[PDB]
Design a protein around this ligand. Sequence first.
Ligand code: CHT
Ligand code: CHT
Ligand code: CL
Ligand code: CL
Ligand code: CL
Ligand code: CL
Ligand code: CL
Ligand code: CL
Ligand code: CL
Ligand code: CL
Ligand code: CL
Ligand code: CL
Ligand code: CL
Ligand code: CL
Ligand code: CL
Ligand code: NA
Ligand code: NA
Ligand code: NA
Ligand code: NA
Length: 129
Amino acid sequence: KVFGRCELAAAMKRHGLDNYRGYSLGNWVCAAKFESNFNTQATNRNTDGSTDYGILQINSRWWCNDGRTPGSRNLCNIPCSALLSSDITASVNCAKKIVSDGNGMNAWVAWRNRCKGTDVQAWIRGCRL
Ligand SMILES: C[N+](C)(C)CCO
Ligand SMILES: C[N+](C)(C)CCO
Ligand SMILES: [Cl-]
Ligand SMILES: [Cl-]
Ligand SMILES: [Cl-]
Ligand SMILES: [Cl-]
Ligand SMILES: [Cl-]
Ligand SMILES: [Cl-]
Ligand SMILES: [Cl-]
Ligand SMILES: [Cl-]
Ligand SMILES: [Cl-]
Ligand SMILES: [Cl-]
Ligand SMILES: [Cl-]
Ligand SMILES: [Cl-]
Ligand SMILES: [Cl-]
Ligand code: NA
Ligand code: NA
Ligand code: NA
Ligand code: NA
């Protein structure tokens, strides 16, 4: 599924991301834009053999099991395929664990490089939430 920005903002709010760990909805929407272009089916393989999955590009190195990332963890206790669903629940629940682990949203490199410090409210401007 490819979301529009306001559709995704509304779904993220329903699933509890609005100001989760102090990060406003615009931060989460901005991260999703630059991680996945709002596409729940996005996958990207890293040079080291891990893979990033879904709307928030969650990495098999730590967070989900894909059976092909040697030495990795599965800290969200989920198959990585579950992070590719049209329903964003599994990705949101796993993202809550990631953002709570000490470094906030800096875990998402694209957020740090493209969203952090910017006018992220523009991502939710005009949206009926
Ligand atoms: C080690 N990380 C913090 C990157 C994830 C495991 O807690
Ligand atoms: C691209 N938008 C204008 C929708 C938000 C970016 O700031
Ligand atoms: Cl899709
Ligand atoms: Cl929209
Ligand atoms: Cl914020
Ligand atoms: Cl915002
Ligand atoms: Cl994801
Ligand atoms: Cl593995
Ligand atoms: Cl594990
Ligand atoms: Cl599994
Ligand atoms: Cl959803
Ligand atoms: Cl923080
Ligand atoms: Cl990470
Ligand atoms: Cl607004
Ligand atoms: Cl809207
Ligand atoms: Na957009
Ligand atoms: Na990424
Ligand atoms: Na893993
Ligand atoms: Na295996």
